Nucleic acid binder design. Sequence first.
RNA 1: UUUAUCAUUGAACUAGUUCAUUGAAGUCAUUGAUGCAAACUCCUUGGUCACACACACGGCGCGGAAGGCGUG
Length: 182
Amino acid sequence: FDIWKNLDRIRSTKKNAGQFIKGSLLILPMRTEDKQQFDECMDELHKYISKDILRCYPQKEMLFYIVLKDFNILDSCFVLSVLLAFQKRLWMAPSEKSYFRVPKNINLTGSFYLPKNIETSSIVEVGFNVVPDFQQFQVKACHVSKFMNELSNFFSQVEFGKCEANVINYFKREYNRTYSQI
RNA sequence: UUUAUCAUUGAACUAGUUCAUUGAAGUCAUUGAUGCAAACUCCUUGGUCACACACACGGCGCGGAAGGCGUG
């Protein structure tokens, strides 16, 4: 249940997981109470993602938008597994404090957004999605190694592209609006 | 393959870039638009005429359609 050996294992058996999908965009928002705790985890995460594929947009009125685009499948396998575990760790094992090491007996849950145009189990698409032009996907409770396999099998099917440049700015507009209403 | 508005103010920033606010207009589309090519399926039309299955040096069956030329 360590992310590096599991990420190499998915590197081996994924049948060409290296190349990046055209016009590929993934948006996961998350809220964290501790800014000092999350800023160092994300800072340690930007090391291998080279800041172009992954960008962090804060929203201040704590809410961060995690935008991951032009990504290879093996990259999203890494990042989403890091973040979704970091989100549970605060409640589960605050004494752990090892970012890439997932502590045992923690099941990964959460949700992420993709553009409404995508062309196609643990990861399921939801009916009745809020954000108008986007579609959110649930990741049911799963072990990390199971999550790598399910996600790696998910991004092999989806074939999508042709998105406007600033669309992320549209996502911010819609997502802030929906919660402003509630 | 290539594309997704302009202007003003503030913050950060190299010496152009990101975020927020104010104003103007704003064909829809990006599953679009441009180029390239194929396969398939379906519609309309015809004398689906007669004699003939006949080893030649490139005709001279009956009609219909469309012309050119000529005489009265």
